[PDB]
Each structure stands twice: as structure tokens, then as C-alpha cells.
Amino acid sequence: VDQLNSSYFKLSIPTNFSFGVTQEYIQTTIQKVTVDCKQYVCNGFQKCEQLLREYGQFCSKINQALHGAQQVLSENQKLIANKFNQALGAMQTGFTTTNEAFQKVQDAVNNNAQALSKLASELSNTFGAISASIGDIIQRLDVLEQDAQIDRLINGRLTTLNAFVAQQLVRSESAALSAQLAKDKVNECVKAQSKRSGFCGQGTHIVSFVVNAPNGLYFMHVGYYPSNHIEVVSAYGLCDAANPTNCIAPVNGYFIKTNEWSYTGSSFYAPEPITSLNTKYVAPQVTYQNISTNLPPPLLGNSTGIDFQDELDEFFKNVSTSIPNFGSLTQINTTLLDLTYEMLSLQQVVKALNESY
Amino acid sequence: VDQLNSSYFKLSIPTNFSFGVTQEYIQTTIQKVTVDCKQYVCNGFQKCEQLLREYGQFCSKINQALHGATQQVLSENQKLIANKFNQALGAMQTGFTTTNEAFQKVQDAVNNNAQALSKLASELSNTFGAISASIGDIIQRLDVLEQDAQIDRLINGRLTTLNAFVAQQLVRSESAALSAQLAKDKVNECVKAQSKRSGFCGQGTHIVSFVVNAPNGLYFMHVGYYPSNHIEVVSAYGLCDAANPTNCIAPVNGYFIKTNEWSYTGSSFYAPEPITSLNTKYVAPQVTYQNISTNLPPPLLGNSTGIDFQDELDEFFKNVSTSIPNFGSLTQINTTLLDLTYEMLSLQQVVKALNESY
Amino acid sequence: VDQLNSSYFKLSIPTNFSFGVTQEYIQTTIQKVTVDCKQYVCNGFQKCEQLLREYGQFCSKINQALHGATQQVLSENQKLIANKFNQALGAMQTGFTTTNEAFQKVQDAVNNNAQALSKLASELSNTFGAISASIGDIIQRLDVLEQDAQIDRLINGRLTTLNAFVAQQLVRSESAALSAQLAKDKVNECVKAQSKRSGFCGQGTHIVSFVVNAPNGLYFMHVGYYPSNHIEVVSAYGLCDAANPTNCIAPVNGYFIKTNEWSYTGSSFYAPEPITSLNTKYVAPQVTYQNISTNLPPPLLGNSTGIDFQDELDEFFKNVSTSIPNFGSLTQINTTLLDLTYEMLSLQQVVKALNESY
Numbered sequence A: 001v002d003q004l005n006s007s008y009f010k011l012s013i014p015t016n017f018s019f020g021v022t023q024e025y026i027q028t029t030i031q032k033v034t035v036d037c038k039q040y041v042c043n044g045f046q047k048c049e050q051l052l053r054e055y056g057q058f059c060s061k062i063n064q065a066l067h068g069a070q071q072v073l074s075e076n077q078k079l080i081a082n083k084f085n086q087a088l089g090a091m092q093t094g095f096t097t098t099n100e101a102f103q104k105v106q107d108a109v110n111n112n113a114q115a116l117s118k119l120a121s122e123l124s125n126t127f128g129a130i131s132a133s134i135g136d137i138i139q140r141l142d143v144l145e146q147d148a149q150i151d152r153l154i155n156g157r158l159t160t161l162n163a164f165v166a167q168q169l170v171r172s173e174s175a176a177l178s179a180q181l182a183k184d185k186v187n188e189c190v191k192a193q194s195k196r197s198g199f200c201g202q203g204t205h206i207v208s209f210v211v212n213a214p215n216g217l218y219f220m221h222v223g224y225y226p227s228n229h230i231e232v233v234s235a236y237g238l239c240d241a242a243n244p245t246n247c248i249a250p251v252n253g254y255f256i257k258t259n260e261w262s263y264t265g266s267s268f269y270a271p272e273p274i275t276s277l278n279t280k281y282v283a284p285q286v287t288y289q290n291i292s293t294n295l296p297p298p299l300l301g302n303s304t305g306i307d308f309q310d311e312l313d314e315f316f317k318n319v320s321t322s323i324p325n326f327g328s329l330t331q332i333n334t335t336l337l338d339l340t341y342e343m344l345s346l347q348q349v350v351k352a353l354n355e356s357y
Numbered sequence B, C: 001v002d003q004l005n006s007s008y009f010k011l012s013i014p015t016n017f018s019f020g021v022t023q024e025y026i027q028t029t030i031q032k033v034t035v036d037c038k039q040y041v042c043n044g045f046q047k048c049e050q051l052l053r054e055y056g057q058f059c060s061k062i063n064q065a066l067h068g069a070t071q072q073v074l075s076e077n078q079k080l081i082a083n084k085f086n087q088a089l090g091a092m093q094t095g096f097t098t099t100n101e102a103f104q105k106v107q108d109a110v111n112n113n114a115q116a117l118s119k120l121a122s123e124l125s126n127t128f129g130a131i132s133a134s135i136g137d138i139i140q141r142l143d144v145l146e147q148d149a150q151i152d153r154l155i156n157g158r159l160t161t162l163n164a165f166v167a168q169q170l171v172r173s174e175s176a177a178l179s180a181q182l183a184k185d186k187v188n189e190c191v192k193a194q195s196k197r198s199g200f201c202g203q204g205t206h207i208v209s210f211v212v213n214a215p216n217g218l219y220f221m222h223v224g225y226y227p228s229n230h231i232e233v234v235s236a237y238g239l240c241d242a243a244n245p246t247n248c249i250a251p252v253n254g255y256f257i258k259t260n261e262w263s264y265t266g267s268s269f270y271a272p273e274p275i276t277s278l279n280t281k282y283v284a285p286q287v288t289y290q291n292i293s294t295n296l297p298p299p300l301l302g303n304s305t306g307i308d309f310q311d312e313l314d315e316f317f318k319n320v321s322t323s324i325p326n327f328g329s330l331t332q333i334n335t336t337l338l339d340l341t342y343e344m345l346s347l348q349q350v351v352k353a354l355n356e357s358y
């Protein structure tokens, strides 16, 4: 033919063979695994045990997936009497006011005192209650702060369980395909001679005893392998004719050119004339290309979709506490009633009165 | 034979073949990947870097899994005033004495009240500032706790995508690894030898197959003949031609066909040849043994999961309502307004009346 | 040859075959799955709806991975008392004047105390109400933070199961994809042609096969001959010059057997035929080359993990003990019991005695 390349392709046919023994262990066993989350995820600070209980039934589901695998003097007396009458009346009136005012003062100062006493007592109780509310808030705040770190670690260990459950899930299927290879070799090798090369020994198979082994079957295949390979120009196919019309194609062996064309088998360079036994008439060089390919996809780029900051900004609230200092004034500077020592000066007046006595 | 269906089965046997070239790339390479968790999970707000540090050694373990891949009387009048004077003078001292004692007593007490107002006020101011100190710190500590949680929810969210992406990189890696066994198999059963099995290197049979190394995997330009026009004939699942199944003949290396009586043929060509002991291995007397066998895989991701979130949340959730309390207080100090002390001015008027009266 | 074991190896060669039918379903379909994370992870208390929004694009990425799949003296007598009276009268006003000044001074001061008590009390009430406002809001904000965390633990709990279920749906999808290659392989090397290899379609060789499309995958009914009673004979791995080996004969297309001397036979039948150049490709002089090779996979999920939780928690954990404090206070406002003002009543008696005396 005249394919994409020239008719000439060069092949190495096998001149001599040597016997080859291959010992192979195809593994067919992976012990099933039970994940006890309270133990694997933690079992340490019991804070983890309680915290995991809130976490959920993750353990049940992960295990489901894995289980799948004279008269004037008298007038002077009257003058004294008039002075006395005025003085006596005045003394009582001033004293009467003194009595009224001091009496009024006593109730008022006492009223002030009770007021001071009551306010202080209530003040003490309110503050203690302020302490009670504030004290509990702090402890409740502390459990909330301490719990979070135990929460971040539990979540961290759980991220490793999901990845390890994935490794155990991928290892289990991988072994399962391996048992189909092992079933296949047992049927197409131990129980029969296998035409396909490379499926039990390099070169063809002349037997294949198998034995069971610790987790999987160990097969001691035995067969011949090629040793020295002769090389000859050969034709992809010989369209015998002057360019394409009707053509001959090698069947069971490449068509080779001696050192003209002569047929040979794949096993041995055994030149034999090209005859209708070795050829199935192929078409007139209808060489049909059929490109086909096999592919897989990779998705874990290191960066990820976006930077953390943009993602955090759409939902994050920077949140600044409106810290406040409760407003207060020390307006009660003093109540220093003073110079009451003038009462001592009034006492000096009493001393003059005592001297008058 | 008389199998589950009638002896008749219709087979299309090849009449003319045409040459065919397949160019095939079997991929045998996936770069191993290293996950830098501080960078993948963040490297952004450093809040993630500190927060992830508490998160743990998740990075180390995930990497292990991925790395796996009348003168006297006048005197008596004076004596009468003098007796009034004796009583009055004594009375004046006593009233003044009480006045001195009371005002003195009042001064110490009012001053005692003053210290009391002063001390309580000062202590009150200090306690409040401390109330502010404790309350102020609590709020800031509360704020870090609220702000940290959102950064914590996002870190967990990015980590959930890593476990799924480490799983895709783990599944892709084994999938390529089986693919290299196909590539090893084709290299051994195709490039290095002619392969009897059809469909393993070229449609139809194979007459050569040169491999070449390619960017990540081997590229094989296999060449072989493919069937082009297929003739069709009634054929028999194999039968002795005998009336009653005592023993029967089974086609070997080719189907048995009926011409337009029975004649043998190969799989490659409708080359009729008489049925002879060369083409047949004697099969048993119609012991047609059925053997149903099947291959299955399981689907587990139903959209809704085991239970609704609310029931799951209720068994452990506490609705939790803060027992908010307003500290109880009373404004009982309505007033201390001593008033009508103006009567002291009235007393002053009384003093004024007798001042200069003598 | 003289391989690791002795030349002798015992083989069972088929004597009679019986017809065998296998019905096989190779599954080639796994419906693709779309995960609605708001529904799967939550759908419940809308707290899980809003909280998940903080988690971010976990849903988008997981979906990408899954989508990948004497007359004068008398006047003087009274006058001398009157002279004392003149001082006494003036003194009485002077004492009263002090009384007026002091009581006036007291009034302003006691009123100064009154304002002090009133102002402090009012301010005290306002500050406390504000203490209640700040403390009250903190508690409610504390409550949302505690309540949100439990919804956060459960949402993160359900999200952990999604990562494992997305991994099972991802592993099932590739596993089906390899299965379609088996199905493509059987269709090309079985339904479209007779297959030399045993095992690909029917125990024993294959004499025809018909596929038929089935609910999710192809159901192939295959028919072929299968061996029934197998004769056993001593056979030789290979046969040499029956001496120190110079060159040897190796069975080709069939084992070499010893009768009850050596005689060749095919794999299909114990048909003894003399060893001849047709059945032997000359092998080398017992160059028996061993080539040990094996297939292995690795297991990583030991129950324990790298370290106990406590050590891991300790390196980063802060036990954190709240410095709870009780704001310091003193109840020093002892009763200001001004008392014994009853002496004012005693002073009143003094006035009464002289008012009567007048």
C-alpha cells in the first residue's frame, strides 16, 4: 500500500528463543475498615467527645460509603418694765423660731440621712448584681472562646478523615479491578494455553501453575521468550500490481524482502513463497485512518478560584465593637459646713450674759 | 443443539477486507502535586494563617495520601423686775446653752453627712470606671470571637473543596496508573508481536504496530486489515445433523453455515468447506449449561441525605435565650430641700425690734 | 529444561467438551449528579441557609469535580441691774445674730447637701440604665454567637459527609468508565469476531455471541464449548537432548506429554502425535531466565492517626480562664442619725418658764 509513510516499514522477527519463568502475585485482598469517629477524630480531651456529638452522624454515613467496599423713779421702774416687757416678749419669739427651725432642721437632716442610707444600700445591691451578670457573661464568653479552638482542631482532623476515607475508597476499587485481572489470568492462563503474549510470561506460555498466597494468588508462569531478533525491510502490505488496483495483505505474518517479496510467520524468519494460504485479498489500498486517543483530566491547581480576601469581603463584617465608657460626673465636691465655731462666739455671748447674772 | 433460543442464529462473515491505520495516544503521566495549605486555603487575610495554624496537621496528612500517588414698796417694784431679771438671765443662758449644744451637734452631724456624700461619690466613680473596664474588654473579646467565626467558616469552606479536589487528584492518579498497564499490555502484545485478538491495536487484525514516545504518553501508529463488506447466512449454534442429541459436532475456529445441509467456514472468510474431523471437536450431547453472570457498581449520593437538618439539629441544639436582666434601681432620693429657713429672718426682725429698743 | 522445580509438571488436558451459554450485563451508565448544597447541606432552619452562605463556593467547586464525570441709791440699784441688762440685752441680740448667721449658713449648706444628693442620685440612675443597655446587648450578641456555633458544627458535619459522598460518586463514575472499555473490548473481540482467548465470552472457547442493548448497559448472550472431563499426564516443562543441555525442543501450541519417551499434544485434546519440527520451535540451551515481578496497592487508614488529640490541642490551645472580677465596693454610708434635738424642746421649756414669768 502507500500509507501515511512509505510502503517500507522495518521489523525485527525472532531468530532464537530461551525459556523464561515469571513469578507474579496479583493481590485480591484489602481488609474492610471500620472508622470509629469518637476514637479516630479524638478520644482525647472529652471536650472533643461532647463537641463531636453535636457534630452529627458523619460517622454513620462515612461508614456506609466504606461498607460499600418718787413718781419719776417709779416711771424709771415703768421704763425698766417697758424694756422688760419688750425684751421678754422678744426673747420668747426668737427662741420660738429657734425651736421651730431646729425642729424643722432635725427632720430634714434626718430625712437627708435616710436618703443617703437608702441610696447607698440599694447602690451596693445593684453593683453586686452588675457583678453577677458581668461574671457569668465572662465565663460564658470563655467557654465560647475555648470551645472554638477544640472546634477548629476537630474540624481539622475531620478534613483528614475525608481524605483518608477517599484513599481507602480508591484503594478498594483498585484492588477490585485487580481481581478481574487475577480472574482473567486464571481462566486464560492456568486453565488454558494463551495465544496472547505478555499475558503470563514474556513470549508465549507453555504452562502456568498457580498457588494461593498470603493475600492474593501467586502464579509461577513458564514460557519461551525471544533472544536474538533478525531485521528486514518489510512492506506494510504488498499491493501486488503497478500501484493500487487489487492487493495482497500478510495474514499471520509480515511480508518481507530477501537480501521481490517472500512471506514469513511472526514466530520465525522462515521465508516461504507468498501464496494464497498466507494472504487474504485486501481492498485497493483503501487505507482508512482512524485517529482515536485516551485521556484523563487534572483539576487541583494550587491557587484555587479566587484569593481569600475577596471571598471574605463579600460576606465579612469587620465588626468594631462600639466600646463605651458609661458617662459619670464627680459633681459632689464637698458639703463642708464650717465656721460653726461662731457658736463658740455665741457661747462667749452666754459668758457675758453669765457675767450680767 | 436446542439452546434457550432455536438452533438458528444469523452471522455476518467477512467478504472483503480494507487496510486501516489507527494513531493512538495512551497517557502514562500525571505530575505529582504538592498542596501548600497556607497558600491554597489562604495567604490572604493573615487571619487565615493564624486560624489555620490552630486547624492542625491536615496539610501533612493530605500530602501523605497524594504522595502515595412707798420707798420700800418702790424697792419691791425694782425687786419684782430683779426677780424677773434673775429668771430671765438664767433662762437666756439655758436657751443659749441648748443652742450651742444643738448647733455644735448639728455641725458634726452635717459634716458627717458631708463626708458620707463625698466618700460614696468617689467610690461610686471608681467602681463605675471599673464596670466600664470589665464591660469594655468583654465587648472587644466578644468582637474577636464573632469576627473569627466568619473567617473560620470560610476556612472550613475552602477546606471542604480541598478534600474533594484531593479526591479528584487521587482518582485521576489511579486512573492513569491502570492506563499504563494498558500501555504496557499493548507494547508487549502489539509493538513486539502480531496480536491474534482483534480490537487490541487496529480495527480488524494487526500486521505491524510501531510505537513512538510522545509528550506525556506513548503514541502508537498501529496498522491492520478491517472487514469491509459482510456476507450473511443462517448458521447453527452447532449441531450433529443427527435427529436425536446422542452426541453432536461443534464448530472449531469457525461458525458452521448452511448453503443456499451444513458446511463449515472460518471466521475470516465465507470459504465453504465440507464439515470434517479437522474443523470439529466433538461436544457433549446437548449438555447446554447456562451460567448467568453480571457486573455491577453502586450509587450512593442521593440528593436529600438521611434526615432533614431540623430534626438532626433539635436533638442537640439549645435554642438558648439570654436571661437578659435590667439591674433593678429606685430614684427614691426625691429631695432634701430644707425650706422656710426664712423664719430665721423673722427671728432676726424680733432681734431688730429689741436692738436699739433700749 | 531443569527449572526451579524438576522437569516434571502435571497438566490436565481436556478430553470432552459441553456447550455453554453465558448471559452477561456490562454496565456502561452512571447518571451524572448535581449537588444542591443549600438543599443537601441545609434546607432546614434558615440559620443553615444563611450560615452556609458564609462558607462560600464549596458548592461550585464540588460540582466542577462531579461534572468532570437711799432714794438715789435705789434708782442706782435697778440701774446697776439695768447696766447688766444693757449688756445682756445687747448680748441677747448678738447671740441671736450668730444664730441667724449660723442657721442661714446651715440652710445653704443643707440645701447644698440636698442638691448633692439629688444630682448624684439622678446621674446614678442614668448610668445604671446604660450599664443595663450595654450589658443587655452583650448578652444577646453572646447568645447569637453560642447558638450560631452549634448550627456551625452541624453544617460542617453534613459538609464532611458530602466530601465523602462526592468521593464515592467520583470513584463509582471512573469505575463505570473502565467498565465501558471492557464493554467496548468485548463488543470488538467477541460479538464482531470469534475470540481465540478463553474467558472473554463463555467458559471455554467462543462459537458466536450476540449483544442486545439493555436498561443501562449491554446484555451479551455468548455461546461457546467448555471442557468437561480433564485427563491428567506427567508432562515436561520442555524437552532437551536428554543429557547435559546443548539445545532443546520446546512445545509450540501444545504441551509435550509422556505416555503410559515423549509425545506432543495440543492444548485442546489429548491427541498424542510424535514430536516433530511442526510442533517445536528450537529454544535455547536451558537458558531459563527468572523474572520475578509483582502487583501491589497501599493501605493508609489506620484507626489511630498520627498523634493523640490532647498533644495536638496543647501546642496551640489556651486553657483560658476568665479573670472574673467583682467590682470593689464599700457600704460605709452609716446612718447619719442626728438626734437629741429634743433639747430644743428643753429650750422651749426655758422660754415657757419666762413667758409665764413675764
Ligand SMILES: *[C@@H]1O[C@H](CO)[C@@H](O)[C@H](O)[C@H]1NC(C)=O
Pocket (backbone or CB within 6 Å): A004, A005, A006
Ligand atoms: C513519511 O512521509 C512523508 C510524506 O512523504 C515524508 O515527508 C516523510 O519523510 C516520511 N517519513 C519519514 C519520517 O521519513
Ligand SMILES: *[C@@H]1O[C@H](CO)[C@@H](O)[C@H](O)[C@H]1NC(C)=O
Pocket (backbone or CB within 6 Å): A015, A016, A227, A228
Ligand atoms: C541462533 O540460532 C542459530 C541457528 O540455530 C545458531 O547458529 C545460533 O548459535 C543461535 N544463537 C544465537 C547466537 O542467537
Ligand SMILES: *[C@@H]1O[C@H](CO)[C@@H](O)[C@H](O)[C@H]1NC(C)=O
Pocket (backbone or CB within 6 Å): A241, A242, A243, A244, A245
Ligand atoms: C494506479 O493507481 C491509479 C490511481 O492513482 C489507478 O487509477 C490505476 O488503475 C492504477 N494502475 C494500476 C493498473 O495498478
Ligand SMILES: *[C@@H]1O[C@H](CO)[C@@H](O)[C@H](O)[C@H]1NC(C)=O
Pocket (backbone or CB within 6 Å): A300, A301, A302, A303
Ligand atoms: C500554581 O498556580 C499558578 C497560577 O495558576 C501557576 O503559575 C503555577 O505554575 C501553579 N503550579 C502548579 C504546579 O500547579
Ligand SMILES: *[C@@H]1O[C@H](CO)[C@@H](O)[C@H](O)[C@H]1NC(C)=O
Pocket (backbone or CB within 6 Å): A312, A313, A316, A317, A318, B045
Ligand atoms: C478591617 O480593618 C483593618 C484596619 O483597621 C484592615 O487592616 C483589615 O484588613 C480589615 N479586615 C477585612 C475587612 O478584611
Ligand SMILES: *[C@@H]1O[C@H](CO)[C@@H](O)[C@H](O)[C@H]1NC(C)=O
Pocket (backbone or CB within 6 Å): A354, A355, A356, A357, B090
Ligand atoms: C454664772 O451663772 C451661774 C449659775 O447661775 C452662777 O452660779 C455664777 O455665779 C455666774 N457667774 C458669773 C460670772 O456671774
Ligand SMILES: *[C@@H]1O[C@H](CO)[C@@H](O)[C@H](O)[C@H]1NC(C)=O
Pocket (backbone or CB within 6 Å): A281, B015, B016, B229
Ligand atoms: C471481493 O473480492 C472478490 C474476490 O476478488 C470479488 O469478486 C468481489 O467483487 C470483491 N467485492 C468488492 C466489495 O470489491
Ligand SMILES: *[C@@H]1O[C@H](CO)[C@@H](O)[C@H](O)[C@H]1NC(C)=O
Pocket (backbone or CB within 6 Å): B302, B303, B304, B305
Ligand atoms: C432526591 O432524593 C429524593 C429522596 O430523598 C428522591 O425521591 C428524588 O427523586 C431525588 N431527586 C429529586 C428529583 O429531587
Ligand SMILES: *[C@@H]1O[C@H](CO)[C@@H](O)[C@H](O)[C@H]1NC(C)=O
Pocket (backbone or CB within 6 Å): B317, B318, B319, C045
Ligand atoms: C427557636 O424558637 C423560635 C421561636 O419559637 C423558633 O422560631 C425557632 O425555630 C427555634 N429554633 C430552634 C430550631 O431551636
Ligand SMILES: *[C@@H]1O[C@H](CO)[C@@H](O)[C@H](O)[C@H]1NC(C)=O
Pocket (backbone or CB within 6 Å): B332, B333, B334, B335
Ligand atoms: C420620696 O420618695 C419616697 C419613696 O419611698 C416616698 O416615700 C416619699 O414620700 C417621697 N417624698 C416626697 C418629698 O414626696
Ligand SMILES: *[C@@H]1O[C@H](CO)[C@@H](O)[C@H](O)[C@H]1NC(C)=O
Pocket (backbone or CB within 6 Å): B355, B356, B357, B358, C090
Ligand atoms: C441696733 O442695730 C443698728 C444697726 O446695726 C445700730 O445702728 C444700733 O446702734 C443698734 N443699737 C443697739 C444699741 O443695739
Ligand SMILES: *[C@@H]1O[C@H](CO)[C@@H](O)[C@H](O)[C@H]1NC(C)=O
Pocket (backbone or CB within 6 Å): C015, C016, C228, C229
Ligand atoms: C467422553 O467421550 C468418550 C468418547 O469420545 C466417551 O468414551 C466418554 O464416556 C466420554 N466421557 C468423558 C470421560 O468425558
Ligand SMILES: *[C@@H]1O[C@H](CO)[C@@H](O)[C@H](O)[C@H]1NC(C)=O
Pocket (backbone or CB within 6 Å): C244, C245, C246, C285
Ligand atoms: C555441560 O555442562 C558443563 C557444566 O555445566 C558445561 O561446562 C558445558 O558447557 C555443558 N555443555 C552443554 C552445552 O551441554
Ligand SMILES: *[C@@H]1O[C@H](CO)[C@@H](O)[C@H](O)[C@H]1NC(C)=O
Pocket (backbone or CB within 6 Å): C302, C303, C304
Ligand atoms: C487500631 O487500634 C489499635 C488500638 O490498640 C492499634 O493498636 C492498631 O494499630 C490500630 N490498627 C488497626 C488494627 O486497625
Ligand SMILES: *[C@@H]1O[C@H](CO)[C@@H](O)[C@H](O)[C@H]1NC(C)=O
Pocket (backbone or CB within 6 Å): A045, C310, C313, C314, C317, C318, C319
Ligand atoms: C484545661 O484545664 C483543665 C482544668 O485544669 C484541665 O482539666 C484540662 O485538661 C485542660 N485542658 C487542656 C488540654 O488544656
Ligand SMILES: *[C@@H]1O[C@H](CO)[C@@H](O)[C@H](O)[C@H]1NC(C)=O
Pocket (backbone or CB within 6 Å): C352, C353, C355, C356
Ligand atoms: C405665755 O404668756 C401668755 C401671757 O398672756 C399666756 O397667755 C400663755 O398661756 C403663756 N404660755 C405659756 C405656756 O407659758
